[PDB]
């Protein structure tokens, strides 16, 4: 089962904020690159480099 590995960052956000990151993912310019996938409602596989952006954008956004 050690078939495949992928370095990624695991984000453990709440059931409220997660959907904003996804929203952030779409309807965005130079984006949609951001989320690898939604593993759980709470957790997402995302970014790497994008994490700095996702966090900052969330901050700036309401």
């Amino acid at each position: 089962m050690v078939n495949v590995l992928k370095g990624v960052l695991i984000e453990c956000d709440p059931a409220m904020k997660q959907f904003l990151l996804y929203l952030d993912e779409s309807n965005a310019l130079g984006k949609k690159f951001i989320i690898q996938d939604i593993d759980d409602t709470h957790v997402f596989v995302i970014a790497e480099l994008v994490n700095v952006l996702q966090e900052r954008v969330g901050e700036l956004m309401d």
């Binding site: 089962m1 590995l5 960052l9 453990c12 957790v43 596989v45």
Partner: protein
């Protein structure tokens, strides 16, 4: 009179018994201090002997004058003993003892100037690795050594003392780290150095804990694992992450799991053997 040797003897016995491993000696040594002491002491085991050595000079503070001179006489013996002996605990003991002899003003500046012990304090002072505890006794020794010289007219030691200058790099480090304790020790060295030789030398805050919390926000740096060949290899590789305590998440119906970066390598090794 006869009672005197007996009573104090019992505490000599107690210190002797739990002499080796820890730091039992300090309290008992003090009691021992009051009641050729140095010559006789020398035979006894080093640790504890040094402890007694340390506190006795401190304890001195007419007949007292006689005592100091007597101590001065065998300052060499302790000094010979100090070197040669030279853990952090031991190291603390050797400088603490040296420091104590220094304040007494019994030690000969010459002799001290050319001795390994002075090199050793700045050596530990230089190295980043030494702990805060070693640092404070090392620092104190230096301060006391300089304190001892109330002249510098005739004090070769106030040359080697200059070895403080070497410390600045160490202070730069220490500063880089948030080691306030170390820095304070440095300042004491500087201030003391200047002192000896000065003549010769020319609500509202509620938003501030919230602004601190704005600098912390979570995610983890991570490996994901997928496309696992059969369930036994998820469960082995998963249980071997869970005992390593670096599972961030798991879902057995996905056959998918997550490890933070610090145990990527123990997983990469277990994936290769079994």
């Amino acid at each position: 009179p006869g009672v005197l040797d007996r009573l104090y003897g019992h505490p000599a016995t107690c210190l002797a018994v739990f002499r080796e491993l820890p730091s039992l000696a300090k309290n008992w040594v003090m009691r021992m201090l009051f009641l050729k002491k140095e010559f006789s002491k020398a035979q006894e085991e080093s640790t504890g002997l040094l402890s007694g050595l340390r506190i006795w000079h401190t304890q001195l503070l007419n007949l007292r004058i006689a005592l100091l001179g007597g101590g001065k006489a065998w300052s060499d013996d302790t000094s010979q003993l100090g070197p040669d002996k030279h853990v952090l605990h031991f190291m603390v003991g050797s400088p603490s003892a040296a420091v104590s002899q220094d304040l007494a003003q019994l030690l000969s500046q010459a002799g001290l100037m050319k001795s390994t012990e002075p090199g050793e304090p700045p050596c530990i002072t230089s190295a980043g690795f030494q702990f805060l505890l070693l640092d404070t006794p090392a620092q104190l020794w230096y301060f006391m050594l300089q304190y001892l010289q109330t002249a510098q007219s005739r004090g070769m030691d106030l040359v080697e003392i200059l070895s403080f200058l070497f410390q600045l790099s160490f202070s730069t480090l220490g500063k880089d780290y948030s080691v306030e304790g170390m820095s304070d020790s440095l300042l004491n060295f500087l201030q003391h150095l200047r002192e000896f030789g000065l003549v010769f030398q020319r609500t509202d805050q509620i938003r501030l804990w919230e602004l601190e919390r704005d600098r912390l926000r979570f995610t983890e740096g991570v490996l994901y694992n997928q496309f696992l060949s059969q369930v036994d290899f998820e469960l082995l590789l998963a249980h071997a992450r869970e005992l390593g305590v670096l599972v961030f998440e798991n879902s057995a119906k996905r056959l998918m799991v997550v490890t933070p970066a610090g145990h990527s390598d123990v997983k990469r090794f277990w994936k290769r053997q079994k």
